[PDB]
Amino acid sequence: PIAQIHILEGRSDEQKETLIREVSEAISRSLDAPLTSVRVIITEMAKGHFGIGGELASKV
Amino acid sequence: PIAQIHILEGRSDEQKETLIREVSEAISRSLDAPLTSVRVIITEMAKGHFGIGGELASKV
Amino acid sequence: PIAQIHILEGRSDEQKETLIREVSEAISRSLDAPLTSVRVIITEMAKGHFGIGGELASKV
Amino acid sequence: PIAQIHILEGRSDEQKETLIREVSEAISRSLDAPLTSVRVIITEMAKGHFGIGGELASKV
Amino acid sequence: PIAQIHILEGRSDEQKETLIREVSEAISRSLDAPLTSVRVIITEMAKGHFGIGGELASKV
Amino acid sequence: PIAQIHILEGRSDEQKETLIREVSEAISRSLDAPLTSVRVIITEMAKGHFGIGGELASKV
- DSSP string over F19-55: HHHHHHHHHHHHHT--GGG-EEEEEEE-GGGEEETTE
DSSP-assigned beta bridge partners for residue B56: B51
Domains of chain B (ranges, CATH numbers): 1-60 (3.30.429.10)
Closest chain A CA to residue F43: A43
Of D43, D48, D52, the CB nearest to E39: D52
Cα gap F51→E2, rounded to integer Å: 12
Cα separation values, A49 from A33, C52, E23, Å: 34, 21, 31
Taking the CA of residue D12 and the nearest CA in chain A, the distance in Å comes to 10
Cα gap D49→D58, rounded to integer Å: 9
Enumerate neighbours of A (3 or more CB pairs within 8 A).
B, D, E, F
Catalytic residues of C: 1
Which residues in chain B touch residue C3, judged by CB atoms under 8 angstroms apart? 3-6, 23
Which residues in chain E touch residue D59, judged by CB atoms under 8 angstroms apart? none
Mutate to test the interface with B, among C15, C17, C18, C30 (most CBs of B within 10 A): C30
With a CB cutoff of 8 Å and minimum separation 6, the contacts of C12 are none
Number of CB pairs, chain E paired with chain F, less than 8 A apart? 62
Contact between F9 and F42 (Cβ < 8 Å)? no
Cβ within 8 Å, pair E54-C41? no
Which residues in chain D touch residue A27, judged by CB atoms under 8 angstroms apart? 5, 19, 22-23
Contact between E51 and C39 (Cβ < 8 Å)? yes
Which residues in chain E touch residue A41, judged by CB atoms under 8 angstroms apart? 2
Taking the CA of residue C49 and the nearest CA in chain E, the distance in Å comes to 16
Nearest CA to C25 among C12, C15, C40? C40
Outline where DSSP puts E strands in chain A: 2-8, 39-45, 50-52, 55-56
- DSSP string over D2-58: EEEEEEES---HHHHHHHHHHHHHHHHHHHT--GGG-EEEEEEE-GGGEEETTEEGG
Helix (H) or strand (E) holding E4: strand E2-8
User: Between the CA atoms of B18, B19, B20 and B25, what dihedral angle is there, to the nearest 10 degrees?
Assistant: 90
**Is E1 one of the catalytic residues?**
yes
- Taking phi first (over 0 means left), then psi (-120 to 50 degrees means alpha), and beta for anything else, what does residue F10 get? left
3-state DSSP assignment of residue A60:
coil
* Amino acid identity at D4: Q
